Design a protein around this motif. Structure first.
Motif, mmCIF file in Angstrom:
data_model
loop_
_atom_site.group_PDB
_atom_site.id
_atom_site.type_symbol
_atom_site.label_atom_id
_atom_site.label_comp_id
_atom_site.label_asym_id
_atom_site.label_seq_id
_atom_site.Cartn_x
_atom_site.Cartn_y
_atom_site.Cartn_z
ATOM 1 N N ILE A 46 61.278 9.811 0.541
ATOM 2 C CA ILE A 46 61.745 8.832 -0.436
ATOM 3 C C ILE A 46 61.027 7.501 -0.253
ATOM 4 N N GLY A 47 60.992 6.988 0.979
ATOM 5 C CA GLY A 47 60.368 5.697 1.206
ATOM 6 C C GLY A 47 58.891 5.700 0.873
ATOM 7 N N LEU A 48 58.181 6.760 1.271
ATOM 8 C CA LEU A 48 56.751 6.799 1.011
ATOM 9 C C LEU A 48 56.473 6.857 -0.481
ATOM 10 N N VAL A 49 57.185 7.712 -1.226
ATOM 11 C CA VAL A 49 56.893 7.789 -2.655
ATOM 12 C C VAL A 49 57.190 6.451 -3.323
ATOM 13 N N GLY A 50 58.328 5.835 -2.984
ATOM 14 C CA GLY A 50 58.658 4.553 -3.585
ATOM 15 C C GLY A 50 57.618 3.487 -3.293
ATOM 16 N N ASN A 51 57.204 3.379 -2.030
ATOM 17 C CA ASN A 51 56.314 2.284 -1.669
ATOM 18 C C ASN A 51 54.888 2.519 -2.146
ATOM 19 N N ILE A 52 54.398 3.761 -2.128
ATOM 20 C CA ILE A 52 53.070 3.989 -2.686
ATOM 21 C C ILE A 52 53.084 3.699 -4.178
ATOM 22 N N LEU A 53 54.183 4.037 -4.864
ATOM 23 C CA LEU A 53 54.276 3.702 -6.278
ATOM 24 C C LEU A 53 54.220 2.193 -6.484
ATOM 25 N N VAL A 54 54.940 1.439 -5.647
ATOM 26 C CA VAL A 54 54.926 -0.020 -5.759
ATOM 27 C C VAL A 54 53.520 -0.570 -5.541
ATOM 28 N N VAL A 55 52.808 -0.058 -4.533
ATOM 29 C CA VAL A 55 51.453 -0.543 -4.267
ATOM 30 C C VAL A 55 50.529 -0.243 -5.439
ATOM 31 N N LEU A 56 50.606 0.977 -5.984
ATOM 32 C CA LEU A 56 49.744 1.325 -7.110
ATOM 33 C C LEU A 56 50.025 0.438 -8.312
ATOM 34 N N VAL A 57 51.297 0.123 -8.560
ATOM 35 C CA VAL A 57 51.612 -0.744 -9.692
ATOM 36 C C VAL A 57 51.099 -2.160 -9.452
ATOM 37 N N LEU A 58 51.318 -2.707 -8.253
ATOM 38 C CA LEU A 58 50.964 -4.106 -8.024
ATOM 39 C C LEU A 58 49.461 -4.331 -7.941
ATOM 40 N N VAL A 59 48.695 -3.356 -7.451
ATOM 41 C CA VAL A 59 47.272 -3.606 -7.232
ATOM 42 C C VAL A 59 46.541 -3.799 -8.558
ATOM 43 N N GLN A 60 46.982 -3.104 -9.610
ATOM 44 C CA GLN A 60 46.163 -3.002 -10.815
ATOM 45 C C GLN A 60 46.158 -4.295 -11.630
ATOM 46 N N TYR A 61 47.301 -4.975 -11.758
ATOM 47 C CA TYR A 61 47.331 -6.211 -12.547
ATOM 48 C C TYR A 61 46.742 -7.356 -11.721
ATOM 49 N N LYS A 62 45.434 -7.551 -11.893
ATOM 50 C CA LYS A 62 44.758 -8.627 -11.178
ATOM 51 C C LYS A 62 45.095 -9.989 -11.774
ATOM 52 N N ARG A 63 45.128 -10.085 -13.106
ATOM 53 C CA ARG A 63 45.339 -11.379 -13.746
ATOM 54 C C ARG A 63 46.745 -11.905 -13.488
#
Ligand SMILES: CC(C)CCC[C@@H](C)[C@H]1CC[C@H]2[C@@H]3CC=C4C[C@@H](O)CC[C@]4(C)[C@H]3CC[C@]12C
Lengths: 234, 225, 339, 302, 58, 64
Positions: free
Chosen positions: D31-48
């Motif tokens: 649970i923790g890994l799926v949640g946190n990898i999802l958070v990282v993937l979402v946050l990395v992409q929006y650079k602006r």
């Protein structure tokens, strides 16, 4: 009007230190990169130092490296050269040169008046102007040549050859800023053409004001090397 | 690196241009944008005078906050072609004249000026570009209302009015009638101020409303909404 | 009543014009281009992305040399780009940030911009001082400036929300010709390749062919149901295409004075922001509010391709004079070069 | 002669723990890994759209990922009743574990102070909530986490119990009590007292503002704030109390070996309790916001 | 109001000049555009892509 | 935390190191330190790390 006025040149003892200054008027100093070029009594132009716009890149010739410092003060529009451990070879007339770089720009397009410095008592491209002097008569066409150590044609498609005119008692004037590109305020009589290592400047309907020494320069890589100089007479 | 000396110098110039653009954008992001709308000329010029031929920009600073106000009066063209240029404005300041209920447009005699103001408010408030932006409503010339309500009944403009012809209920009725046009009440707020030709607190009211808009946007950014 | 007589005269004249146009339509473009081999699938790819604008991009214009670009954003910034290396050549601060149009002169010496300030600003690119300066400010319109196009270094044509167009002599700052006859806002201009005619499209759902030298309207074209936002000449100058809020592109022929072809799809319900042709004129590229660009076969009216990659409204298009690349700019603050 | 003192064998408790700890550790990990990898993937992409909150949330996700990285090795140790790795591995895992713990707590504190500046000092936050300050404060916080993880790395080592191996801290002789007291109190004062104090002050300010001229959305936000504080308190107080008791289990207990085994069971259960906060964090700080879910949906659609 | 009659007149002469235009049949204009597109087919990089060696944006 | 084995009492007299096989330094988890021993008969033994002769002979035992 565009103006570069230079100061700080005078008689100096060997091993001393002198600081040359170049005030700038009539243009945006910060935008332009600045070069120092010197001419000895032998009258062959030699590049000395370059400071980029914003001071990001500084380049020096091997001879002056470690003894000469180039700095710019953008708010006061002044370029400075600090010279230490002065040597007899250093005696020369020093020129402040304006140079801006972008797609389609014309670098080396304005030169200062120059100041006199008097000192008491392998991978570089070599540029070869075979003919030292050409006697000419007004109205005829004259061809000047400039051979190069290596091909000046880059993979972009640019050939990095520059032609300058120095009239008696004046600073050099840019004529052709890239092979076959004509400078502003320059008559259509001057033309440039070449390929690879061979280059030619053609003057048609020659006039009296054309009399002077013609130099050829490469801008492919630093250091920037000038030709020996071809003189027109009569 | 397969670049000429002049190519490297060109890239260095491009990089300096990038730093200048970033500095300008950082300065731009930290200022408040206000779109100043009014039906005809209600109190708009007086509001501008207190807070101090295309779009007119006004700059001012209040309590360490920088305000840019854009007046699009004297632009008599189709609004739906340039209104989307103000999609990201911080707030819309809408000026409506209270005394202009009995009067008429003088271009078309049948329509009251107050009804034209309400039509403009309805078009602006429910415009698709302004779904989540807030409106600061200024009801101007209240004192000139005070002299007129005690002779001219408000029923001339609002026949359904069934209150007393004194200024408290009349002004409350007008405010409620304007706020009832808000068909998106869960996304945007309307801040209403009763002002006059001689008031000093209008800038304070705008500052407080803009502070609320900024706090709401920060709530949306921080994840508390 | 003289006014009634004039109105009836106008109505019968319009009937006569419509009858002549109907008599000239012996066939359609679709029954002649029936035997043409279809284009196939057009698959263009992003080769460059241009970053640096920090707001919505409204306009772009290619240079004649097909390397240099100018783009205008609500940052209050004009940027001149080197498209080959992605270098920014120039960044021009604007006195008014509400720009809607920009133009780059055929000589390469000047750039024009303007918008909700009602003014067309002409900028000198090649000065001795080394910076870009304001060459001229052209005033005289009373509504917003929607499009501007150079004829040479001294003449420029602008269109406005005045319902008028104007031809200006840049040296004197004076309006040399005024083109009147539209009833709604004029949104777009396109110059003929020989530069002796205009087409302008307006918010009255009409397009008008103008003669530059005489200052009078040669022809009027109708058929759209809403505002025309974009207009472009066919490469040979004998036809033009218009784009509108009703989701349809239309091809009009000057000599036949009619409408030849309609480009529409059932899945397309948004307005068209921009149109442009390729060099041969066979492909018609149009930007949409669907956040993308469509490539139509201009002779079949079939959809040949799609350019997707913008996260917001595709606001501006361009094709280079030699036809190598397409440039698209959108409200997501990005420019993309496609091959 | 040695027939007077004999150690009690905690084999029953180890056998029981091998059957209860891994089956919960696996679910916590997934649970923790799926949640946190999802958070990282979402946050990395929006650079602006990057702001200081995005920096802090990204670093919180990284801290949780580090801590969940230590978990498989512990799972393995519980299952096989032996350490099948090297001494350097024990030291690296101890360092990773305490770094993840302390960095998680400090980045929660940073997110809370970010919220306080954004809401209570919204005008002042325009000049202060910049990405540069976010990156710098992230560097100092990571340095502090590494510095607080030093004793784990320095003291931990592996040693051999009679057909199996153990990673343990093995503090110096005659000084176990003082160093255990130091480590327990650093965990207590930087795990509960400081984070809880910061949450109380900052969220008191935030709730005070949200309740002037109230709306439905502001009431929902106040409810969420209360949920955050309650979850933090109940998930972290058990572990800290059990650790602090375990330090002084000699004096508190009247008997030993029949009761400190019970204490050991308590320690393993509150370990999982405190472990699950790494799972709770992505829901609390990332999923509830509208922009995050909207940009996540855009991630699915692209 | 004479302004209405003046506007109506100006419209009348505008339609008068627009009515006296020599038009060609559509079957010939369509043929002309089709011939133009066929003549310049090979010069269109967007319709017939060029090899990557000749693409300045490669 | 793995509930390592540890001693709750110590031997009053010095442990004869001759009757030994192996040694362990007790883990940090338990409250008080100790050193586990293993004898010939195999029942476990321990005393203080600072005891009479634990440090005298603990080196004499090797895992070999
Ligand atoms: C236990 C050890 C190995 C942990 C090492 C962690 C350090 C070296 C790493 C792990 C997490 C990293 C951070 C992760 C993301 C961010 C946000 C970014 O926009 C700036 C850099 C920054 C702040 C990184 C800097 C490097 C960093 C701090």
């Amino acid at each position: 009007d565009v103006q570069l006025v230079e100061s700080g040149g005078g008689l100096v003892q060997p091993g001393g230190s002198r600081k040359l200054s170049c005030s700038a008027s009539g243009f945006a100093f910060s935008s332009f990169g600045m070069h120092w070029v010197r001419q000895a009594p032998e009258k062959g132009l030699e590049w000395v130092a370059y400071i980029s716009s914003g001071s990001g890149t500084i380049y020096y010739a091997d001879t002056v490296k470690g003894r000469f410092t180039i700095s710019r003060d953008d708010p006061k529009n002044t370029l400075f050269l600090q010279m230490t451990s002065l040597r007899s070879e250093d005696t020369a007339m020093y020129y402040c040169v304006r140079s801006i770089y972008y797609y389609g720009s014309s670098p080396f397009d304005f030169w200062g008046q120059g100041t006199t410095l008097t000192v008491s008592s392998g991978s570089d491209i070599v540029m070869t102007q075979a003919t030292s002097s050409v006697p000419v008569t007004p109205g005829e066409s004259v061809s000047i040549s400039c051979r190069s150590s290596k091909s000046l044609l880059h993979s972009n498609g640019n050939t990095y050859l520059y032609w300058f005119l120095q009239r008696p008692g004046q600073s050099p004037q840019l004529l052709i800023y890239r092979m076959s590109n004509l400078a502003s305020g320059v008559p259509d009589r001057f033309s440039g053409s070449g390929s690879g290592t061979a280059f030619t400047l053609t003057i048609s309907r020659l006039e009296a004001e054309d009399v002077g020494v013609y130099y050829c320069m490469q801008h492919l890589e630093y250091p920037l090397t000038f030709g020996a100089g071809t003189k027109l007479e009569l | 690196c397969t670049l000429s000396a002049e190519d490297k110098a060109a890239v260095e110039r491009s990089k300096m241009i990038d730093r200048n653009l970033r500095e300008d954008g950082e300065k731009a992001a930290r200022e408040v944008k206000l779109l100043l709308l009014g039906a005809g000329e209600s109190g708009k010029n007086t509001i501008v005078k207190q807070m101090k031929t295309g779009i007119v920009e006004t700059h001012f600073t209040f309590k360490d906050l920088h305000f840019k106000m854009f007046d699009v009066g004297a632009q008599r063209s189709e609004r739906k072609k340039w209104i989307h240029c103000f999609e990201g404005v911080t707030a819309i300041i809408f000026c409506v004249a209270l005394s202009d209920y009995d009067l008429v447009l003088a271009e078309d005699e049948e329509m009251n000026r107050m009804h034209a103001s309400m039509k403009l408010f309805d078009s602006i408030c429910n415009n698709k570009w302004f779904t989540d932006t807030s409106i600061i409503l200024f009801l101007n010339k209240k004192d000139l209302f005070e002299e007129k309500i005690k002779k001219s009944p408000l029923t001339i403009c609002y026949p359904e009015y069934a209150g007393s012809n004194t200024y408290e209920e009349a002004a409350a009725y007008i405010q409620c009638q304007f706020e009832d046009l808000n068909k998106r009440k869960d996304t945007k707020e309307i801040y209403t101020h009763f002002t006059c030709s001689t008031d000093t607190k209008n800038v304070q009211f705008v500052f407080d409303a803009v502070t609320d808009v900024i706090i709401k946007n920060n709530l949306k950014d921080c994840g508390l909404f | 009543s003289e006014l009634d007589q004039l109105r009836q005269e106008a109505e019968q004249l319009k009937n006569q014009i419509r009858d002549a146009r109907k008599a000239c339509a012996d066939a359609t473009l679709s029954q002649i281009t029936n035997n043409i081999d279809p284009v196939g699938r057009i698959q263009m790819r992003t080769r460059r992305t241009l970053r640096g604008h920090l707001a919505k991009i409204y306009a772009m214009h290619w240079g004649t040399d097909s390397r240099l670009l100018v783009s205008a954003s609500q940052d209050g910034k004009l940027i001149i780009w080197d498209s080959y290396t992605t270098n920014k050549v120039h960044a021009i601060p604007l006195r008014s940030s509400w720009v809607m149009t920009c133009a780059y002169a055929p000589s390469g010496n000047y750039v024009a911009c303007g918008g909700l300030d009602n003014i067309c600003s002409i900028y000198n690119l090649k000065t001795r001082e080394g910076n870009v300066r304001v060459s001229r400010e052209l005033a005289g319109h009373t509504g917003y400036l929607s499009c501007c196009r150079f004829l040479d270094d001294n003449q420029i044509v602008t269109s406005s929300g005045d319902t008028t167009c104007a031809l200006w002599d840049i040296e004197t700052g004076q309006q040399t010709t005024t083109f009147t006859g539209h009833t709604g806002d004029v949104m777009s201009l396109s110059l003929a390749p020989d530069t002796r005619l205009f087409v302008s499209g307006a918010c009255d759902a009409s397009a008008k062919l103008w003669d530059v030298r005489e200052g009078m309207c040669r022809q009027t074209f109708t058929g759209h149901e809403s505002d025309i936002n974009a207009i472009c000449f066919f490469p040979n100058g004998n036809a033009f295409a218009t784009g509108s809020d009703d989701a349809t592109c239309r091809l009009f022929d000057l000599r036949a004075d009619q409408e030849l072809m309609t480009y529409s799809h059932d899945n397309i319900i948004c307005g068209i922001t921009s149109v442009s042709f390729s060099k041969s004129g066979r492909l018609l590229l149009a930007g949409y509010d669907d956040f993308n660009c469509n490539v139509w076969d201009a002779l079949k009216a079939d959809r040949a391709g799609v350019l997707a990659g913008h996260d917001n409204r595709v606001s501006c298009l361009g094709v280079t004079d030699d036809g190598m690349a397409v440039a698209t700019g959108s409200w997501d603050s990005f420019l993309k070069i496609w091959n | 002669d040695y027939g007077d003192a004999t150690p009690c064998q905690k084999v029953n408790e180890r056998a029981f723990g091998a059957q209860l700890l891994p089956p919960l550790y696996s679910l916590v990990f997934v649970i923790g890994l799926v949640g946190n990898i999802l958070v990282v993937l979402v946050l990395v992409q929006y650079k602006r759209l990057k702001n200081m909150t995005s920096i802090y949330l990204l670093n919180l996700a990284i801290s949780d990922l580090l801590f969940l990285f230590t978990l498989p090795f512990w799972i393995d140790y519980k299952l096989k009743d032996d350490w099948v790795f090297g001494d350097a591995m024990c030291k690296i895992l101890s360092g990773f574990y305490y770094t993840g713990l302390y960095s998680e707590i400090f980045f929660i504190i940073l997110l809370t102070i970010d919220r306080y500046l954004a809401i209570v000092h919204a005008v002042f936050a325009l000049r202060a909530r910049t990405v540069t300050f976010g990156v710098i404060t992230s560097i100092i916080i990571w340095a502090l986490a590494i510095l607080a993880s030093m004793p784990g790395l320095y003291f931990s080592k592996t040693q051999w119990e009679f057909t199996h191996h153990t990673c343990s801290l093995h503090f110096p002789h005659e000084s176990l009590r003082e160093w255990k007291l130091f480590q327990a109190l650093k965990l207590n004062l930087f795990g509960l007292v400081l984070p809880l104090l910061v949450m109380i002050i900052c969220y008191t300010g935030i709730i005070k503002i949200l309740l002037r001229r109230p709306n439905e959305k502001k009431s929902k936000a106040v409810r969420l704030i209360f949920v955050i504080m309650i979850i933090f308190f109940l998930f972290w107080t058990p572990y800290n109390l059990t650790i602090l008791i375990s330090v002084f289990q000699d004096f508190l207990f009247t008997h030993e070996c029949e009761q400190s085994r019970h204490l050991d069971l308590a320690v393993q259960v509150t370990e999982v309790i405190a472990y699950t906060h790494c799972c709770v964090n992505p829901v609390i700080y990332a999923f509830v916001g509208e922009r995050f879910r909207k940009y996540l949906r855009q991630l699915f659609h692209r | 109001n004479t302004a209405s009659i003046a506007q109506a007149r100006k419209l009348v002469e505008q339609l008068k000049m627009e009515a006296n235009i020599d038009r060609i049949k559509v079957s010939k204009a369509a043929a002309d555009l089709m011939a133009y597109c066929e003549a310049h087919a090979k010069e269109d990089p967007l319709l017939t892509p060029v090899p990557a060696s000749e693409n300045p944006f490669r | 935390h793995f509930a390592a084995d540890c001693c709750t009492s110590y031997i009053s007299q010095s442990i004869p190191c001759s009757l030994m096989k192996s040694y362990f330094e007790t883990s940090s988890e338990c409250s008080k330190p100790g050193v586990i021993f293993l004898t010939k008969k195999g029942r476990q033994v321990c005393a203080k790390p600072s005891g009479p002769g634990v440090q005298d002979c603990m080196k004499k035992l090797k895992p070999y």
